[PDB]
Amino acid sequence: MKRTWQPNRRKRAKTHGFRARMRTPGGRKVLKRRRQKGRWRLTPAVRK
Amino acid sequence: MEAKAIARYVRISPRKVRLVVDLIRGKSLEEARNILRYTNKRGAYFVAKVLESAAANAVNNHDMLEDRLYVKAAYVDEGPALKRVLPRARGRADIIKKRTSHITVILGEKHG
Amino acid sequence: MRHLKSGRKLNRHSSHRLALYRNQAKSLLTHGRITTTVPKAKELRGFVDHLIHLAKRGDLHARRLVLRDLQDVKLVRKLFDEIAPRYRDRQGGYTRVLKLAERRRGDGAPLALVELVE
Amino acid sequence: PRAKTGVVRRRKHKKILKLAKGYWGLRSKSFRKARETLFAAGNYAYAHRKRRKRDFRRLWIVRINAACRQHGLNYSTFIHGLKKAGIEVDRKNLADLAVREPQVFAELVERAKAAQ
Amino acid sequence: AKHPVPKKKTSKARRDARRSHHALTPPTLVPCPECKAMKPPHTVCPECGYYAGRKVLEV
RNA sequence: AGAUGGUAAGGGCCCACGGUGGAUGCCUCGGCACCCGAGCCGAUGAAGGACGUGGCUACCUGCGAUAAGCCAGGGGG
RNA sequence: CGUGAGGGAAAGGUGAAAAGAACCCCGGGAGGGGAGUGAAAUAGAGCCUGAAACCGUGGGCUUACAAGCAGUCACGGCCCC
RNA sequence: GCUGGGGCUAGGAGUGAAAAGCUAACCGAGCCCGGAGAUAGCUGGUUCUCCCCGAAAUGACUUUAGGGUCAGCCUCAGGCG
RNA sequence: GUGGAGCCUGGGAGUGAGGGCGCGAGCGAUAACGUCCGCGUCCGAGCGCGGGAACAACCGAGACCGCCAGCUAAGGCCCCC
RNA sequence: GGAUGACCCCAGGCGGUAGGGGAGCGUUCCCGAUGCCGAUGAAGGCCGACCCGCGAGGGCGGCUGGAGGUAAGGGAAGUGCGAAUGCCGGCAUGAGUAACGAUAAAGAGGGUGAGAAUCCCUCUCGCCGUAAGCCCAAGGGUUCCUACGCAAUGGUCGUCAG
Ligand SMILES: [Mg+2]
Ligand SMILES: [Mg+2]
Ligand SMILES: [Mg+2]
Ligand SMILES: [Mg+2]
Ligand SMILES: [Mg+2]
Ligand SMILES: [Mg+2]
Ligand SMILES: [Mg+2]
Ligand SMILES: [Mg+2]
Ligand SMILES: [Mg+2]
Ligand SMILES: [Mg+2]
Ligand SMILES: [Mg+2]
Ligand SMILES: [Mg+2]
Ligand SMILES: [Mg+2]
Ligand SMILES: [Mg+2]
Ligand SMILES: [Mg+2]
Ligand SMILES: [Mg+2]
Ligand SMILES: [Mg+2]
Ligand SMILES: [Mg+2]
Ligand SMILES: [Mg+2]
Ligand SMILES: [Mg+2]
Ligand SMILES: [Mg+2]
Ligand SMILES: [Mg+2]
Ligand SMILES: [Mg+2]
Ligand SMILES: [Mg+2]
Ligand SMILES: [Mg+2]
Ligand SMILES: [Mg+2]
Ligand SMILES: [Mg+2]
Ligand SMILES: [Mg+2]
Ligand SMILES: [Mg+2]
Ligand SMILES: [Mg+2]
Ligand SMILES: [Mg+2]
Ligand SMILES: [Mg+2]
Ligand SMILES: [Mg+2]
Ligand SMILES: [Mg+2]
Ligand SMILES: [Mg+2]
Ligand SMILES: [Mg+2]
Ligand SMILES: [Mg+2]
Ligand SMILES: [Mg+2]
Ligand SMILES: [Mg+2]
Ligand SMILES: [Mg+2]
Ligand SMILES: [Mg+2]
Ligand SMILES: [Mg+2]
Ligand SMILES: [Mg+2]
Ligand SMILES: [Mg+2]
Ligand SMILES: [Mg+2]
Ligand SMILES: [Mg+2]
Ligand SMILES: [Mg+2]
Ligand SMILES: [Mg+2]
Ligand SMILES: [Mg+2]
Ligand SMILES: [Mg+2]
Ligand SMILES: [Mg+2]
Ligand SMILES: [Mg+2]
Ligand SMILES: [Mg+2]
Ligand SMILES: [Mg+2]
Ligand SMILES: [Mg+2]
Ligand SMILES: [Mg+2]
Ligand SMILES: [Mg+2]
Ligand SMILES: [Mg+2]
Ligand SMILES: [Mg+2]
Ligand SMILES: [Mg+2]
Ligand SMILES: [Mg+2]
Ligand SMILES: [Mg+2]
Ligand SMILES: [Mg+2]
Ligand SMILES: [Mg+2]
Ligand SMILES: [Mg+2]
Ligand SMILES: [Mg+2]
Ligand SMILES: [Mg+2]
Ligand SMILES: [Mg+2]
Ligand SMILES: [Mg+2]
Ligand SMILES: [Mg+2]
Ligand SMILES: [Mg+2]
Ligand SMILES: [Mg+2]
Ligand SMILES: [Mg+2]
Ligand SMILES: [Mg+2]
Ligand SMILES: [Mg+2]
Ligand SMILES: [Mg+2]
Ligand SMILES: [Mg+2]
Ligand SMILES: [Mg+2]
Ligand SMILES: [Mg+2]
Ligand SMILES: [Mg+2]
Ligand SMILES: [Mg+2]
Ligand SMILES: [Mg+2]
Ligand SMILES: [Mg+2]
Ligand SMILES: [Mg+2]
Ligand SMILES: [Mg+2]
Ligand SMILES: [Mg+2]
Ligand SMILES: [Mg+2]
Ligand SMILES: [Mg+2]
Ligand SMILES: [Mg+2]
Ligand SMILES: [Mg+2]
Ligand SMILES: [Mg+2]
Ligand SMILES: [Mg+2]
Ligand SMILES: [Mg+2]
Ligand SMILES: [Mg+2]
Ligand SMILES: [Mg+2]
Ligand SMILES: [Mg+2]
Ligand SMILES: [Mg+2]
Ligand SMILES: [Mg+2]
Ligand SMILES: [Mg+2]
Ligand SMILES: [Mg+2]
Ligand SMILES: [Mg+2]
Ligand SMILES: [Mg+2]
Ligand SMILES: [Mg+2]
Ligand SMILES: [Mg+2]
Ligand SMILES: [Mg+2]
Ligand SMILES: [Mg+2]
Ligand SMILES: [Mg+2]
Ligand SMILES: [Mg+2]
Ligand SMILES: [Mg+2]
Ligand SMILES: [Mg+2]
Ligand SMILES: [Mg+2]
Ligand SMILES: [Mg+2]
Ligand SMILES: [Mg+2]
Ligand SMILES: [Mg+2]
Ligand SMILES: [Mg+2]
Ligand SMILES: [Mg+2]
Ligand SMILES: [Mg+2]
Ligand SMILES: [Mg+2]
Ligand SMILES: [Mg+2]
Ligand SMILES: [Mg+2]
Ligand SMILES: [Mg+2]
Ligand SMILES: [Mg+2]
Ligand SMILES: [Mg+2]
Ligand SMILES: [Mg+2]
Ligand SMILES: [Mg+2]
Ligand SMILES: [Mg+2]
Ligand SMILES: [Mg+2]
Ligand SMILES: [Mg+2]
Ligand SMILES: [Mg+2]
Ligand SMILES: [Mg+2]
Ligand SMILES: [Mg+2]
Ligand SMILES: [Mg+2]
Ligand SMILES: [Mg+2]
Ligand SMILES: [Mg+2]
Ligand SMILES: [Mg+2]
Ligand SMILES: [Mg+2]
Ligand SMILES: [Mg+2]
Ligand SMILES: [Mg+2]
Ligand SMILES: [Mg+2]
Ligand SMILES: [Mg+2]
Ligand SMILES: [Mg+2]
Ligand SMILES: [Mg+2]
Ligand SMILES: [Mg+2]
Ligand SMILES: [Mg+2]
Ligand SMILES: [Mg+2]
Ligand SMILES: [Mg+2]
Ligand SMILES: [Mg+2]
Ligand SMILES: [Mg+2]
Ligand SMILES: [Mg+2]
Ligand SMILES: [Mg+2]
Ligand SMILES: [Mg+2]
Ligand SMILES: [Mg+2]
Ligand SMILES: [Mg+2]
Ligand SMILES: [Mg+2]
Ligand SMILES: [Mg+2]
Ligand SMILES: [Mg+2]
Ligand SMILES: [Mg+2]
Ligand SMILES: [Mg+2]
Ligand SMILES: [Mg+2]
Ligand SMILES: [Mg+2]
Ligand SMILES: [Mg+2]
Ligand SMILES: [Mg+2]
Ligand SMILES: [Mg+2]
Ligand SMILES: [Mg+2]
Ligand SMILES: [Mg+2]
Ligand SMILES: [Mg+2]
Ligand SMILES: [Mg+2]
Ligand SMILES: [Mg+2]
Ligand SMILES: [Mg+2]
Ligand SMILES: [Mg+2]
Ligand SMILES: [Mg+2]
Ligand SMILES: [Mg+2]
Ligand SMILES: [Mg+2]
Ligand SMILES: [Mg+2]
Ligand SMILES: [Mg+2]
Ligand SMILES: [Mg+2]
Ligand SMILES: [Mg+2]
Ligand SMILES: [Mg+2]
Ligand SMILES: [Mg+2]
Ligand SMILES: [Mg+2]
Ligand SMILES: [Mg+2]
Ligand SMILES: [Mg+2]
Ligand SMILES: [Mg+2]
Ligand SMILES: [Mg+2]
Ligand SMILES: [Mg+2]
Ligand SMILES: [Mg+2]
Ligand SMILES: [Mg+2]
Ligand SMILES: [Mg+2]
Ligand SMILES: [Mg+2]
Ligand SMILES: [Mg+2]
Ligand SMILES: [Mg+2]
Ligand SMILES: [Mg+2]
Ligand SMILES: [Mg+2]
Ligand SMILES: [Mg+2]
Ligand SMILES: [Mg+2]
Ligand SMILES: [Mg+2]
Ligand SMILES: [Mg+2]
Ligand SMILES: [Mg+2]
Ligand SMILES: [Mg+2]
Ligand SMILES: [Mg+2]
Ligand SMILES: [Mg+2]
Ligand SMILES: [Mg+2]
Ligand SMILES: [Mg+2]
Ligand SMILES: [Mg+2]
Ligand SMILES: [Zn+2]
């Protein structure tokens, strides 16, 4: 039956994207934390 | 004088090969060859090659006579197991161990 | 219980088992000698023997009978013309099964050869 | 500083496991099972050390009794006779006498009858 | 059913006792009357192709 | 009539030798604590990256189409 | 692994020096046997040491009329020193 | 009526032809990180050896009754004799 | 009456679910391996030992270690024994 | 007794849970140590029926191992595991057992190759056909084509393959 992951790139980018993160005070902090931790990818990679 | 051959990391389960190895212990080289030839098991192929390779060393390297050779000793040890996943129902995963054998054959000369 | 029952099942249903026998007849009657598993071999005997014994009859009826199993007009033509006559004086036993010495590698199945007799 | 287990535990286990040689299955191979068996074996020995002293005396009494009845009297009579005679040779020796030196035992039986 | 399960680990001794029947019987072989090589009886000799005193098969 | 042995399909205990496995000891490029030193960077586009960059180059490092490097001063041999 | 915020491992050691095993043999290979290197190769790269569970081979004692927390005490038989 | 794509509404909040339904495979109050080593009068666990002594399961009070405070009973040191 | 007796000051506890049995009561049905007190005891902690076929608390008896020596307790002395 | 923990003699105590007290053993580290043991072999490992100690332990000897270890006397602690449905890893048992994923279905001949029920070719047989055929869009991201391969992946095999 229909499971929970139904990929959609526009949705993916418009949600967890870089610009989305930068727009909100909460999201900017995500990027701060991820950088501080040293994540290789601050934001979900998506092929546009 | 003895001659030996060891096939290590043979991808077959020790318990299975021993069944075949047991068939030729203490037999003349000629008798063993006869047995392995008509033994209906996968292991027979592997045990065969180690037997021949041991007989080869006997004639070549160790100054023994093919017409005197018998299987003085033979045994399988177990080598590192290959662990693989086997997906079961309701999300559970099992772990299959694809086992491994170190087959040894040691040949001696029956004087007379 | 299986008391006094004749004919193997060979793990095939009715139509498949029949097809198996027909196709093996076509194969045997075409090359004169085929290799199969010992059980299929033995069963093949009577199935073909009856076909051969009908080619010996020669009539149109016999041709139309044998054609139900064999289908191939060319083959049946070979059966009546080339095969059948060398069994004119022979009464049954037109085939033979001889068991081979080596088993199959992938499943250890015992093999044997079926052939038309000289 | 840090003092990790290191060598100590393996050594303690081997002591036990060596003491458990000869036992059946994991009792001689598994440390834990070896220990449980060794506890029982310590109590058994202590108990059987104490009871070995009984086990033999009962044998001695059976044997002395066997030789006595050959001479027409029973053990309970024989011992009393010996007491009245004032003979204090023990049962370990009486039994040895009863078998190795039968004529000597005969004489003791005599003095036993004479005493009453 | 309520999922039966072993109560105790099988001992090394009991495991091995169960396997007292698991031994293989060596193949039964007779000499070929033509080429003296060993082969299963009632089988066409895979070494020389002879059965019943005649050539039957290319080897 | 009486009696007492060799039997091992397999099993058990001990011994020897192996296999598996990676504990122990030794080691340390790394870590930890304290003290001292030092302490801002950015529209002259930071922090951090993407993609590139080698004769042959997957990755790391370095570098930016002048791309494992260009110029000059000092150091060194 | 998780849609995501986020979670989050395992994995160090040949040798003084690669001298990292030319060549020959069995094998399709893997592997092994000789040869050679080394003080050492059960230091051979699946590499220091290499414990235990666990698996096996060989040897000694033993077991198919026997009732068991498996030991313990006694005696005897057999094998060993 | 069903359905693709593009959107909006969320945690004491959303949404609900109403089942406390659903809000990323457990919703009478989602998930992650933090407070946080919350708190647990409860349960479990607590690692070498030898030597001497050796209890209690009672009383009183207790939002107390399988928890406590004092008393009783054990032990060690000094003193009294 | 010199005893792992007693008294005084102080350090450290643990216990504050007891249980069987005998005798004296209540409660119960002159019921319960029942319940609630009292005096004693043992088990608890002596599931160490002999007896009771077996059996924490009934009888015997308080196990520092050793002995292939002796005497007894309860209980026993036809055979198992 | 002798005078003091010097050893001897006589006597009595010595079941033990919660628990109090005492004496010790061992592990890591510091002083002792610019020392001492050490390739004529450190640690660690495997043995031992030997020696000392009530015991925890400590010696000695054999094999392994191949570069560290460390006394008398003192000091300081991440200091002793058998259990926590503990944690991490390794390996067992069940057991050569269930299973090997739609009951549309196979049979022979020829080819290749060290090896073939499973790869290629032919013929026969069966299954789908409002699909089990074809073309888009999502989504996946080189899986496309060819050459050379079969350790692992493929629930078997493999010369074949995403
Ligand atoms: Mg959708
Ligand atoms: Mg996707
Ligand atoms: Mg899109
Ligand atoms: Mg779209
Ligand atoms: Mg965005
Ligand atoms: Mg800001
Ligand atoms: Mg990066
Ligand atoms: Mg990541
Ligand atoms: Mg993000
Ligand atoms: Mg066979
Ligand atoms: Mg040869
Ligand atoms: Mg689940
Ligand atoms: Mg497994
Ligand atoms: Mg039927
Ligand atoms: Mg019939
Ligand atoms: Mg039929
Ligand atoms: Mg039938
Ligand atoms: Mg049949
Ligand atoms: Mg079929
Ligand atoms: Mg079938
Ligand atoms: Mg059909
Ligand atoms: Mg039909
Ligand atoms: Mg008929
Ligand atoms: Mg035949
Ligand atoms: Mg095959
Ligand atoms: Mg440790
Ligand atoms: Mg221990
Ligand atoms: Mg240890
Ligand atoms: Mg050790
Ligand atoms: Mg120790
Ligand atoms: Mg034993
Ligand atoms: Mg013994
Ligand atoms: Mg064992
Ligand atoms: Mg065993
Ligand atoms: Mg073991
Ligand atoms: Mg003990
Ligand atoms: Mg005793
Ligand atoms: Mg006793
Ligand atoms: Mg006595
Ligand atoms: Mg006594
Ligand atoms: Mg007795
Ligand atoms: Mg009398
Ligand atoms: Mg008397
Ligand atoms: Mg007397
Ligand atoms: Mg049912
Ligand atoms: Mg049921
Ligand atoms: Mg059932
Ligand atoms: Mg059912
Ligand atoms: Mg079941
Ligand atoms: Mg069970
Ligand atoms: Mg086992
Ligand atoms: Mg075994
Ligand atoms: Mg069994
Ligand atoms: Mg056969
Ligand atoms: Mg030939
Ligand atoms: Mg006999
Ligand atoms: Mg035996
Ligand atoms: Mg056998
Ligand atoms: Mg036994
Ligand atoms: Mg080993
Ligand atoms: Mg390893
Ligand atoms: Mg700075
Ligand atoms: Mg930058
Ligand atoms: Mg780069
Ligand atoms: Mg320059
Ligand atoms: Mg310069
Ligand atoms: Mg999730
Ligand atoms: Mg992901
Ligand atoms: Mg998390
Ligand atoms: Mg971890
Ligand atoms: Mg090195
Ligand atoms: Mg090095
Ligand atoms: Mg070659
Ligand atoms: Mg060759
Ligand atoms: Mg090939
Ligand atoms: Mg090679
Ligand atoms: Mg070889
Ligand atoms: Mg080599
Ligand atoms: Mg040399
Ligand atoms: Mg040397
Ligand atoms: Mg070695
Ligand atoms: Mg070495
Ligand atoms: Mg090694
Ligand atoms: Mg080293
Ligand atoms: Mg190893
Ligand atoms: Mg081992
Ligand atoms: Mg054996
Ligand atoms: Mg009987
Ligand atoms: Mg018997
Ligand atoms: Mg004995
Ligand atoms: Mg619409
Ligand atoms: Mg829509
Ligand atoms: Mg949408
Ligand atoms: Mg929508
Ligand atoms: Mg909303
Ligand atoms: Mg809304
Ligand atoms: Mg929100
Ligand atoms: Mg909430
Ligand atoms: Mg609301
Ligand atoms: Mg609705
Ligand atoms: Mg979620
Ligand atoms: Mg949810
Ligand atoms: Mg849900
Ligand atoms: Mg709530
Ligand atoms: Mg707080
Ligand atoms: Mg927390
Ligand atoms: Mg603790
Ligand atoms: Mg006491
Ligand atoms: Mg009051
Ligand atoms: Mg009060
Ligand atoms: Mg209450
Ligand atoms: Mg109550
Ligand atoms: Mg409470
Ligand atoms: Mg108090
Ligand atoms: Mg008092
Ligand atoms: Mg005092
Ligand atoms: Mg007292
Ligand atoms: Mg007192
Ligand atoms: Mg006090
Ligand atoms: Mg205290
Ligand atoms: Mg204290
Ligand atoms: Mg309390
Ligand atoms: Mg209370
Ligand atoms: Mg109370
Ligand atoms: Mg109560
Ligand atoms: Mg009460
Ligand atoms: Mg009375
Ligand atoms: Mg009463
Ligand atoms: Mg009353
Ligand atoms: Mg009444
Ligand atoms: Mg009561
Ligand atoms: Mg009563
Ligand atoms: Mg009453
Ligand atoms: Mg009472
Ligand atoms: Mg208690
Ligand atoms: Mg008692
Ligand atoms: Mg008492
Ligand atoms: Mg009794
Ligand atoms: Mg009793
Ligand atoms: Mg009795
Ligand atoms: Mg008893
Ligand atoms: Mg009792
Ligand atoms: Mg009772
Ligand atoms: Mg007496
Ligand atoms: Mg009496
Ligand atoms: Mg009686
Ligand atoms: Mg009487
Ligand atoms: Mg009886
Ligand atoms: Mg008697
Ligand atoms: Mg004394
Ligand atoms: Mg006492
Ligand atoms: Mg005591
Ligand atoms: Mg208590
Ligand atoms: Mg003290
Ligand atoms: Mg220690
Ligand atoms: Mg200490
Ligand atoms: Mg120093
Ligand atoms: Mg030094
Ligand atoms: Mg020196
Ligand atoms: Mg040297
Ligand atoms: Mg040495
Ligand atoms: Mg050390
Ligand atoms: Mg020692
Ligand atoms: Mg050495
Ligand atoms: Mg050593
Ligand atoms: Mg050094
Ligand atoms: Mg040391
Ligand atoms: Mg030191
Ligand atoms: Mg010291
Ligand atoms: Mg000092
Ligand atoms: Mg410290
Ligand atoms: Mg600790
Ligand atoms: Mg414990
Ligand atoms: Mg569990
Ligand atoms: Mg469990
Ligand atoms: Mg359980
Ligand atoms: Mg665990
Ligand atoms: Mg554990
Ligand atoms: Mg585990
Ligand atoms: Mg498993
Ligand atoms: Mg079963
Ligand atoms: Mg079955
Ligand atoms: Mg099956
Ligand atoms: Mg299935
Ligand atoms: Mg199927
Ligand atoms: Mg069906
Ligand atoms: Mg073919
Ligand atoms: Mg073919
Ligand atoms: Mg194939
Ligand atoms: Mg093949
Ligand atoms: Mg149509
Ligand atoms: Mg696309
Ligand atoms: Mg994918
Ligand atoms: Mg790829
Ligand atoms: Mg294409
Ligand atoms: Mg491709
Ligand atoms: Mg190709
Ligand atoms: Mg492959
Ligand atoms: Mg393969
Ligand atoms: Mg292969
Ligand atoms: Mg695979
Ligand atoms: Mg495969
Ligand atoms: Mg699969
Ligand atoms: Mg392709
Ligand atoms: Zn032949």
mmCIF file with all atom_site columns, N, CA and C (backbone and C1' of nucleotides) in Angstrom, chain G residues 35-44:
data_model
loop_
_atom_site.group_PDB
_atom_site.id
_atom_site.type_symbol
_atom_site.label_atom_id
_atom_site.label_alt_id
_atom_site.label_comp_id
_atom_site.label_asym_id
_atom_site.label_entity_id
_atom_site.label_seq_id
_atom_site.pdbx_PDB_ins_code
_atom_site.Cartn_x
_atom_site.Cartn_y
_atom_site.Cartn_z
_atom_site.occupancy
_atom_site.B_iso_or_equiv
_atom_site.pdbx_formal_charge
_atom_site.auth_seq_id
_atom_site.auth_comp_id
_atom_site.auth_asym_id
_atom_site.auth_atom_id
_atom_site.pdbx_PDB_model_num
ATOM 1  P P     . A G 1 35 ? 62.988 -26.476 0.082  1.00 0.00 ? 35 A G P     1
ATOM 2  O "O5'" . A G 1 35 ? 63.382 -25.445 -1.065 1.00 0.00 ? 35 A G "O5'" 1
ATOM 3  C "C5'" . A G 1 35 ? 64.159 -25.866 -2.172 1.00 0.00 ? 35 A G "C5'" 1
ATOM 4  C "C4'" . A G 1 35 ? 64.277 -24.786 -3.216 1.00 0.00 ? 35 A G "C4'" 1
ATOM 5  C "C3'" . A G 1 35 ? 64.903 -23.484 -2.758 1.00 0.00 ? 35 A G "C3'" 1
ATOM 6  O "O3'" . A G 1 35 ? 66.312 -23.533 -2.715 1.00 0.00 ? 35 A G "O3'" 1
ATOM 7  C "C1'" . A G 1 35 ? 62.938 -23.011 -3.956 1.00 0.00 ? 35 A G "C1'" 1
ATOM 8  P P     . G G 1 36 ? 67.083 -22.892 -1.468 1.00 0.00 ? 36 G G P     1
ATOM 9  O "O5'" . G G 1 36 ? 66.688 -21.346 -1.518 1.00 0.00 ? 36 G G "O5'" 1
ATOM 10 C "C5'" . G G 1 36 ? 67.307 -20.476 -2.456 1.00 0.00 ? 36 G G "C5'" 1
ATOM 11 C "C4'" . G G 1 36 ? 66.696 -19.093 -2.480 1.00 0.00 ? 36 G G "C4'" 1
ATOM 12 C "C3'" . G G 1 36 ? 66.844 -18.249 -1.229 1.00 0.00 ? 36 G G "C3'" 1
ATOM 13 O "O3'" . G G 1 36 ? 68.132 -17.689 -1.069 1.00 0.00 ? 36 G G "O3'" 1
ATOM 14 C "C1'" . G G 1 36 ? 64.643 -18.060 -2.035 1.00 0.00 ? 36 G G "C1'" 1
ATOM 15 P P     . U G 1 37 ? 68.635 -17.268 0.395  1.00 0.00 ? 37 U G P     1
ATOM 16 O "O5'" . U G 1 37 ? 67.650 -16.095 0.815  1.00 0.00 ? 37 U G "O5'" 1
ATOM 17 C "C5'" . U G 1 37 ? 67.691 -14.836 0.161  1.00 0.00 ? 37 U G "C5'" 1
ATOM 18 C "C4'" . U G 1 37 ? 66.839 -13.817 0.872  1.00 0.00 ? 37 U G "C4'" 1
ATOM 19 C "C3'" . U G 1 37 ? 67.131 -13.611 2.348  1.00 0.00 ? 37 U G "C3'" 1
ATOM 20 O "O3'" . U G 1 37 ? 68.255 -12.778 2.573  1.00 0.00 ? 37 U G "O3'" 1
ATOM 21 C "C1'" . U G 1 37 ? 64.802 -13.788 2.024  1.00 0.00 ? 37 U G "C1'" 1
ATOM 22 P P     . G G 1 38 ? 69.310 -13.133 3.730  1.00 0.00 ? 38 G G P     1
ATOM 23 O "O5'" . G G 1 38 ? 68.492 -12.898 5.071  1.00 0.00 ? 38 G G "O5'" 1
ATOM 24 C "C5'" . G G 1 38 ? 67.929 -11.630 5.354  1.00 0.00 ? 38 G G "C5'" 1
ATOM 25 C "C4'" . G G 1 38 ? 66.959 -11.698 6.501  1.00 0.00 ? 38 G G "C4'" 1
ATOM 26 C "C3'" . G G 1 38 ? 67.427 -12.445 7.733  1.00 0.00 ? 38 G G "C3'" 1
ATOM 27 O "O3'" . G G 1 38 ? 68.356 -11.730 8.523  1.00 0.00 ? 38 G G "O3'" 1
ATOM 28 C "C1'" . G G 1 38 ? 65.220 -13.076 7.238  1.00 0.00 ? 38 G G "C1'" 1
ATOM 29 P P     . A G 1 39 ? 69.642 -12.493 9.100  1.00 0.00 ? 39 A G P     1
ATOM 30 O "O5'" . A G 1 39 ? 69.056 -13.391 10.275 1.00 0.00 ? 39 A G "O5'" 1
ATOM 31 C "C5'" . A G 1 39 ? 69.842 -14.396 10.900 1.00 0.00 ? 39 A G "C5'" 1
ATOM 32 C "C4'" . A G 1 39 ? 69.218 -14.843 12.198 1.00 0.00 ? 39 A G "C4'" 1
ATOM 33 C "C3'" . A G 1 39 ? 67.785 -15.345 12.096 1.00 0.00 ? 39 A G "C3'" 1
ATOM 34 O "O3'" . A G 1 39 ? 67.713 -16.714 11.759 1.00 0.00 ? 39 A G "O3'" 1
ATOM 35 C "C1'" . A G 1 39 ? 67.925 -13.734 13.810 1.00 0.00 ? 39 A G "C1'" 1
ATOM 36 P P     . A G 1 40 ? 66.718 -17.201 10.600 1.00 0.00 ? 40 A G P     1
ATOM 37 O "O5'" . A G 1 40 ? 65.294 -17.250 11.305 1.00 0.00 ? 40 A G "O5'" 1
ATOM 38 C "C5'" . A G 1 40 ? 65.037 -18.141 12.380 1.00 0.00 ? 40 A G "C5'" 1
ATOM 39 C "C4'" . A G 1 40 ? 63.833 -17.690 13.158 1.00 0.00 ? 40 A G "C4'" 1
ATOM 40 C "C3'" . A G 1 40 ? 62.542 -17.610 12.359 1.00 0.00 ? 40 A G "C3'" 1
ATOM 41 O "O3'" . A G 1 40 ? 61.857 -18.851 12.345 1.00 0.00 ? 40 A G "O3'" 1
ATOM 42 C "C1'" . A G 1 40 ? 62.873 -15.590 13.562 1.00 0.00 ? 40 A G "C1'" 1
ATOM 43 P P     . A G 1 41 ? 61.551 -19.631 10.975 1.00 0.00 ? 41 A G P     1
ATOM 44 O "O5'" . A G 1 41 ? 60.432 -18.748 10.262 1.00 0.00 ? 41 A G "O5'" 1
ATOM 45 C "C5'" . A G 1 41 ? 59.344 -18.216 11.005 1.00 0.00 ? 41 A G "C5'" 1
ATOM 46 C "C4'" . A G 1 41 ? 58.116 -18.017 10.155 1.00 0.00 ? 41 A G "C4'" 1
ATOM 47 C "C3'" . A G 1 41 ? 57.840 -19.108 9.120  1.00 0.00 ? 41 A G "C3'" 1
ATOM 48 O "O3'" . A G 1 41 ? 56.447 -19.389 9.075  1.00 0.00 ? 41 A G "O3'" 1
ATOM 49 C "C1'" . A G 1 41 ? 57.936 -16.989 8.060  1.00 0.00 ? 41 A G "C1'" 1
ATOM 50 P P     . U G 1 42 ? 55.928 -20.877 9.358  1.00 0.00 ? 42 U G P     1
ATOM 51 O "O5'" . U G 1 42 ? 54.918 -20.691 10.576 1.00 0.00 ? 42 U G "O5'" 1
ATOM 52 C "C5'" . U G 1 42 ? 54.116 -19.524 10.676 1.00 0.00 ? 42 U G "C5'" 1
ATOM 53 C "C4'" . U G 1 42 ? 53.303 -19.506 11.947 1.00 0.00 ? 42 U G "C4'" 1
ATOM 54 C "C3'" . U G 1 42 ? 54.096 -19.498 13.246 1.00 0.00 ? 42 U G "C3'" 1
ATOM 55 O "O3'" . U G 1 42 ? 54.419 -18.170 13.628 1.00 0.00 ? 42 U G "O3'" 1
ATOM 56 C "C1'" . U G 1 42 ? 52.321 -21.107 13.350 1.00 0.00 ? 42 U G "C1'" 1
ATOM 57 P P     . A G 1 43 ? 55.844 -17.785 14.267 1.00 0.00 ? 43 A G P     1
ATOM 58 O "O5'" . A G 1 43 ? 56.048 -16.257 13.831 1.00 0.00 ? 43 A G "O5'" 1
ATOM 59 C "C5'" . A G 1 43 ? 56.085 -15.897 12.455 1.00 0.00 ? 43 A G "C5'" 1
ATOM 60 C "C4'" . A G 1 43 ? 55.756 -14.441 12.210 1.00 0.00 ? 43 A G "C4'" 1
ATOM 61 C "C3'" . A G 1 43 ? 55.361 -14.116 10.780 1.00 0.00 ? 43 A G "C3'" 1
ATOM 62 O "O3'" . A G 1 43 ? 53.989 -14.339 10.544 1.00 0.00 ? 43 A G "O3'" 1
ATOM 63 C "C1'" . A G 1 43 ? 56.999 -12.573 11.510 1.00 0.00 ? 43 A G "C1'" 1
ATOM 64 P P     . G G 1 44 ? 53.551 -15.397 9.432  1.00 0.00 ? 44 G G P     1
ATOM 65 O "O5'" . G G 1 44 ? 53.718 -14.602 8.071  1.00 0.00 ? 44 G G "O5'" 1
ATOM 66 C "C5'" . G G 1 44 ? 53.033 -13.377 7.870  1.00 0.00 ? 44 G G "C5'" 1
ATOM 67 C "C4'" . G G 1 44 ? 52.611 -13.220 6.438  1.00 0.00 ? 44 G G "C4'" 1
ATOM 68 C "C3'" . G G 1 44 ? 51.767 -14.362 5.880  1.00 0.00 ? 44 G G "C3'" 1
ATOM 69 O "O3'" . G G 1 44 ? 50.845 -13.834 4.935  1.00 0.00 ? 44 G G "O3'" 1
ATOM 70 C "C1'" . G G 1 44 ? 53.709 -14.124 4.587  1.00 0.00 ? 44 G G "C1'" 1
#
